Every structure is written in C-alpha cells, then in structure tokens.
C-alpha cells in the first residue's frame, strides 16, 4: 500500500468520524490510536454496540481488509454507517496509512 494515497482516502472517507493520533478525541467513532493489535470494542471511553464489543477479533492488516470492504457483513449490527471501500488497492493504501498514523 501507498501511505500518501491512504492518507487521502482516510481524510475523504473516515476523518469525519475518527481521529488517529495518541490522545485524539473520540467522535462519532472511537479514536484509532493503537489500532493494530487492538481487540474489537475495547477503546476506553467509547460507547460501542454489543456487536462491535462481541466480535472477538484483533485488528490488523487482514481483519481490517475484510472489515473495510463491507463493515456490516463483518460486524452485523454495527453502528458504523459506512458502506465500505470496494477496491482492494484502496483498502491496502488506507491500511498502510493506518499502520503508520495509529502508531506515531
Ligand atoms: C461515521 C459516519 C463513520 C465513518 C465515516 C467511519 N466510521 Fe469507523 N466507526 C464508526 C462508529 C460509530 C464505530 C463504532 C461502531 C459500533 O458498532 O460500536 C466505528 C468503528 C470502527 C472500527 C472498530 C474500532 C474498534 O475499537 O473496535 C474501526 C477499525 C473503524 N471504525 C475504522 C474506520 C475507517 C478506517 C473508516 C474510513 C474507511 C471508518 N471507520 C469510517 C463511525 C464511522
């Protein structure tokens, strides 16, 4: 994936609901710092659905690749109202961006 392309995707498709930085605010969706290795539904201070709390997976490259294609298919009942990113390359770029931005 291409980090710079992924940054642009994040701004267009994600940033209205999510921050990535350490100490960034929860918004409509949870702050995503530490995403890689985070268990579903475990960010303190965010009110998740039971569906997101109970999915029982660890976020990382492949679980994110699947989720982001079609969130509701991966986590039925999620309150993340986002249809998905259909192009594999776009998902890969976004994930590469997230891997950097959620760790910095
Ligand atoms: C607002 C309209 C959203 C947009 C646009 C995106 N996300 Fe989101 N996300 C949102 C909510 C309300 C939640 C919680 C859902 C629930 O059912 O409780 C989420 C959740 C995620 C998660 C899971 C995080 C966890 O701690 O388990 C991830 C990884 C995530 N969102 C990522 C993400 C990305 C990368 C987006 C752009 C493609 C994106 N979301 C858009 C709300 C909104």
List all residues 6 or more positions away from 99 whose beta carbon is below 8 Å from its beta carbon. 36, 61
Token pair 């999915």: residue: 55
Locus of tokens 């701004």: 11
- Tell me the resolution in Å: 1.3
Interior CA angle at 97 toward 28 and 30, to 5°? 20
First to last CA, the chain: 18
Per domain, the residue ranges of the chain are 1-104
DSSP string, the chain: --HHHHHHHHHHHTTTT---STTPPP-SS---TT-TTPBTT--TT----HHHHHS--B-SHHHHHHHHH-HHHHSTT----------HHHHHHHHHHHHHHTT-
Q: State which approach was used to obtain the coordinates.
A: X-ray
26 labeled part of a ligand binding site: no
Nearest residue to 69 (alpha-carbon basis) of 4, 7, 13, 8: 13
Query: Distance (Å, rounded) from C-alpha 102 to C-alpha 104?
Result: 6
Q: Assess whether the C-beta atom of 59 lies below 6 angstroms from ligand 1.
A: yes
Burial of 5 (0-12, 13-18, 19+ CB in 10 A): middle
Can you tell me which atom of ligand 1 is nearest the CA of 81?
2
């Amino acid at each position: 994936g291409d980090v710079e392309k992924g940054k642009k995707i994040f701004v267009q498709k994600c940033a209205q609901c999510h921050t990535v930085e350490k100490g960034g605010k929860h918004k409509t969706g949870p702050n995503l710092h530490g995403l890689f290795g985070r268990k579903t539904g475990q960010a303190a201070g965010f009110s998740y659905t039971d569906a997101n709390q109970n999915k029982g997976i660890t976020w990382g490259e492949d679980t994110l690749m699947e989720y982001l294609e079609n969130p509701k298919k991966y986590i039925p009942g999620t309150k993340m109202i986002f249809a998905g990113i259909k192009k594999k390359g776009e998902r890969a770029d976004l994930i590469a961006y997230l891997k950097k931005a959620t760790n910095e």
